[PDB]
Amino acid sequence: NQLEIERLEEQLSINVYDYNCHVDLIRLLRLEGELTKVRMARQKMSEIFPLTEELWLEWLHDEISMAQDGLDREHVYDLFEKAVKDYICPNIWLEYGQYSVGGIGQKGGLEKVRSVFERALSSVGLHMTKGLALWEAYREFESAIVEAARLEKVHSLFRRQLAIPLYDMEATFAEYEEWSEDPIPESVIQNYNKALQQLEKYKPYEEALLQAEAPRLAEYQAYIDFEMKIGDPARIQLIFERALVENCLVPDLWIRYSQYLDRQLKVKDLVLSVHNRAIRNCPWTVALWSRYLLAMERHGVDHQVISVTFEKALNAGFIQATDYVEIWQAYLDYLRRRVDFKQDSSKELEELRAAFTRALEYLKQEVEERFNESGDPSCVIMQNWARIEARLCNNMQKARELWDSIMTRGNAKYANMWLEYYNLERAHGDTQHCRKALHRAVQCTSDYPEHVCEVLLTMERTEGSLEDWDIAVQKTETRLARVNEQRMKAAEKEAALVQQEEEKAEQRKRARAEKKAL
Amino acid sequence: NQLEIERLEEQLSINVYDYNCHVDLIRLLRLEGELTKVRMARQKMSEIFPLTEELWLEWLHDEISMAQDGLDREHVYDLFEKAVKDYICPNIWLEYGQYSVGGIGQKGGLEKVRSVFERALSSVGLHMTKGLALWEAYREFESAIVEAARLEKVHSLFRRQLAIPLYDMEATFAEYEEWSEDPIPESVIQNYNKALQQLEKYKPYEEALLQAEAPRLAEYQAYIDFEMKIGDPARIQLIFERALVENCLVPDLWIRYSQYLDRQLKVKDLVLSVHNRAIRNCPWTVALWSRYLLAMERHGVDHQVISVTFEKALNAGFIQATDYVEIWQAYLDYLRRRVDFKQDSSKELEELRAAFTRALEYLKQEVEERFNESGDPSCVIMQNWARIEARLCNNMQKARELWDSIMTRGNAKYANMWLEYYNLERAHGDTQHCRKALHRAVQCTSDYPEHVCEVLLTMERTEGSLEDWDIAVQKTETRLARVNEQRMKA
């Protein structure tokens, strides 16, 4: 049996991203009874993958069976704390509540049990199908500690629940009437009726969810669309989380959720936790990383931790080269917003300039090596560096050095490219340099040459000397003449190929053998 | 017969630009013998139109026949002076020389005869077909005056002529050996040989010209192409002038000719005579006026005469609305190059700002009434004014006033209009004004809204705060969502 464990152990050392291998290794260590090794393998899997409810539960059950010390109780609590983070988990919460009851009597045991049930209810108390079990477990505990006056607390739990649309809530209203010696107040009956109307209202979606199987993403989306029209922040979070349990590998769903959080709730601890979980579920999508870095910046996360997050993004592994420029650009935009441009020379500015160099080299080395295509064809990073360096810093010279480099890459043929450079020179350079840029455009542009000529003639018309206008008409006339010659000649060749294909089709008319022997 | 004459005179009182009517009025007046009325009709026509050689000759014969030796010889000369101006005219020149011989007895009569023959030879002495008659008339005059020493003058003319390729040139070489007691020198004979080589070169072209029916425009162009390959300035002008005799109504031919003069020769007096002569033949073409104003500026013609030349163009009459903005464009460019922008007074700059205003109004009133279009749909004059006013003068507020007006006239829906405005603000305004322009652009752009959004987003990403970026995505998302709602609706 140990032979097979060693096989799995080495298979993980070659590739640690084999989820099923981790699962197989743990099941075997657990069988062999290696207790410190199972926990070690479980801590190592959990740091890499978010774990499903069933995997957390077996781990929780195992630590609980062996906890034999008051300290191990504390350790089990720490584990429960880890488990609730990955996805919504009504059974884990229920297990946490029931377990925490065992520490009653100790200094904070009564308060602790109330703390976890209350936390459970905030997370899963509105859950149509699995929320009810939590309310019932909470009430049962409260009634078990008191006989005559804490009764107000048990009342409150009955009243809190009956204002919420849950399944079999009807049996809970009846259970409450019998229990209560005091009459059920009119306000409670009205909150219950409105909760029943909500229950009838959400019933078709819950049923569509039930009849559909499985992950039932389309039915989840319809539900989410519905809850957003209604607009209860608490219900919208719930329905997102419910959907994300079965569809955690659908990045657009994470985007949708995090986007709602980033625009509406705007609660730091919540939005960032959700971004992080998106990252653990779908590391391969760059938008998730760039949106994470955005959220960290909006909420004043320390620069060091934002930076270390970015470094993790570079190591996630993406499928496209374009993906790597996107992550670099998000980080670069972030570094750019940290600089005070009102004053040269900022330490932050040198950090920015250092980052740009690093990005271009990273694009030159790592991405080019793996994909064998540059990840930035139109050199958009260099363009941004150039724009910044010329408009925000008084360093037009660096902008020029950059642009000469952008153009050498066969980018010299694009009208829009020359114009991007021209406009940069028109704003922060001199007229002499616009003219040289424009004279170059005319010489090099291959897609829309008439366009760049018009731009050159317009500049000379408005700002140049008569010699300048005359040189401009000469260069443009000459250039356009050459263009029209090749355009016209190539049309001669296509017309010549059509005539060759007509004389080929000609021989086929005069040679039509209706009978074939071969 | 006089009846048809009264009809033509009133038709001219109605419209003075009827060339054939003028020709007909003159034909009847000449025939009817109204000696005083013909001189008038001829003078009033010649000031408007260039006259063909035959029309100048007939006028000249009448004045010479009415020798009214009061004396009109100086006056007849003045007429010849007018006649040589219009086109190349070997018969008018030949006619001028034979006539000038009659005044040889008078003071400096001799220098005058040599003056016109030399002037004639400079214009048409290289003419393959008609140049020879002038060389022969010059020699004939020269051999006729002295016995022993002007014999040299005649020698120089035989030699001068024999170095130039003419038709029937061989018979003049043979004619020279007999007349000349001394042998024909080796240098003269080799220049003759290369000229015979020149005669062979031009022979297929001279003949191709001969076989086609007049104006033989296609055949003339081939010749011009050929002579330009050779690149001899004297020879190039000739073939142009020759072609222009028959094709004076082909503006494209004048353009190539005047263009050759402006790029290659660059001699003030020569280029300006051909440009002036071009507008008189084809006034309806705006390029001819515009190239003319350029040439006057290149050659430093007085500011006052350029303005009157320009004012003349406005009354010429064009077929397109675009033509009127083009001439207006040309004049505005000219006035701008007269301005020193380092000096803010500025005397020239005030004529310029005044000129723009006058121009925009001409398009609103005169051009709009006739065409019911501005002729400047995208407002490039206002665009140019704004650009000048913002980059060269520190008057950015004026550029904005101009741009507001452009957007007001239905250009707010075009992305390129907003971006051009954005780019001006980006260069000579502040960032807050770029932000406002773009925000306006996103709301209004109707043709390519997705594009202007990309431009706003790029800006915020590169210069804006994180909140600025965030506002931009909302504005763009909302705008694009609504746009997409309409393409499904419609």
Swiss-Prot record, chain B:
Location, primary (coarse class): nucleus
Expression sites (tissue/organ): Ubiquitously expressed.
Localization per Swiss-Prot or TrEMBL: Nucleus, Nucleoplasm; Nucleus, Cajal body; Nucleus speckle; Cytoplasm
The organism's place on the tree of life at top rank: Eukaryota
GO biological process terms on file: cell morphogenesis; hematopoietic stem cell proliferation; homeostasis of number of cells; mRNA splicing, via spliceosome; nucleosome assembly; regulation of gene expression; regulation of RNA metabolic process; spliceosomal snRNP assembly
Keywords assigned by UniProt, alphabetized: Acetylation, Coiled coil, Cytoplasm, Methylation, mRNA processing, mRNA splicing, Nucleus, Phosphoprotein, Repeat, RNA-binding
Modified positions (Phosphoserine) in chain numbering: 122
GO cellular component: ASAP complex; Cajal body; cytoplasm; nuclear speck; nucleoplasm; nucleus
Presence of keyword Ligase: no
Residue ranges, annotated region (Required for interaction with USP4): 394-427
HAT repeat ranges per the UniProt record: 33-65, 71-102, 108-144, 149-182, 231-263, 266-298, 301-337, 394-427
Record flagged with keyword Lipid metabolism: no
Membrane-spanning parts: none
GO MF, one example: ubiquitin-specific protease binding
Region (Mediates interaction with PRPF3): 1-258
Quaternary structure and partners: Component of the 7SK snRNP complex at least composed of P-TEFb (composed of CDK9 and CCNT1/cyclin-T1), HEXIM1, HEXIM2, BCDIN3, SART3 proteins and 7SK and U6 snRNAs. Interacts with AGO1 and AGO2. Interacts with PRPF3 and USP4; the interaction with PRPF3 is direct and recruits USP4 to its substrate PRPF3. Interacts with USP15; the interaction is direct. Interacts with HIV-1 Tat.
Function of the protein: U6 snRNP-binding protein that functions as a recycling factor of the splicing machinery. Promotes the initial reassembly of U4 and U6 snRNPs following their ejection from the spliceosome during its maturation. Also binds U6atac snRNPs and may function as a recycling factor for U4atac/U6atac spliceosomal snRNP, an initial step in the assembly of U12-type spliceosomal complex. The U12-type spliceosomal complex plays a role in the splicing of introns with non-canonical splice sites. May also function as a substrate-targeting factor for deubiquitinases like USP4 and USP15.
Name of the protein described by the UniProt record: Spliceosome associated factor 3, U4/U6 recycling protein
